[PDB]
Structures are given as C-alpha cells and as structure tokens.
Amino acid sequence: AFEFKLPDIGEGIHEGEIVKWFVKPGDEVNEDDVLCEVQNDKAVVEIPSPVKGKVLEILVPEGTVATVGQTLITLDAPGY
Numbered sequence: 001a002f003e004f005k006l007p008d009i010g011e012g013i014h015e016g017e018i019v020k021w022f023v024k025p026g027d028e029v030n031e032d033d034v035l036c037e038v039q040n041d042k043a044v045v046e047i048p049s050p051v052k053g054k055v056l057e058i059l060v061p062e063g064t065v066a067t068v069g070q071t072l073i074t075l076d077a078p079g080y
Contacts (some may be wrong), residue, residue, distance in 0.1 A: 002051065002075030005068035007030050016066040025058040025073070035073070038063065053077040 008014060022034035035047035058073040066072045 003066035
C-alpha cells in the first residue's frame with residue numbers, strides 16, 4: 001500500500017511528531033494534497049502526495065507521536 005515510514009526505526013528520526021493533519025481517513029485524495037505537518041529536530045514539515053488514491057485509514061492521527069515499524073496512515077495506489 002503506501003505506508004508512512006520504511007524499515008528505518010534507526011538513527012536520526014525513528015518517530016513522527018504529528019502536530020497536525022490535513023485530511024481525514026476515508027477520503028479520496030488528489031495528486032497535490034498534504035498529509036500531516038510533523039515536527040523534528042529543527043524542521044516542522046510535510047509529506048505531499050507522490051500519489052493519489054484513498055486514505056483508507058489513519059490509526060494515530062495527530063497529537064500523538066508515531067514511530068517507524070508502526071504504521072500511521074496508509075494509501076492505496078493500485079498500480080504503483
């Protein structure tokens with residue numbers, strides 16, 4: 001599907017301080033939307049779309065922190 005982190009859980013940033021989100025789970029996303037607004041060491045940034053598809057589920061939205069290993073949200077992109 002499209003996960004949130006890779007096999008990383010290593011050095012640098014093994015988490016996700018999801019401060020804010022832009023979408024809600026269950027929608028149809030485009031090929032120009034946002035995802036979350038996450039903070040780290042010095043940056044407060046984004047994940048834009050590489051692809052559009054559904055936004056199946058979001059397990060941990062914002063407010064809480066997520067790791068890697070764990071998923072967050074997933075994307076369906078039937079052909080990528």
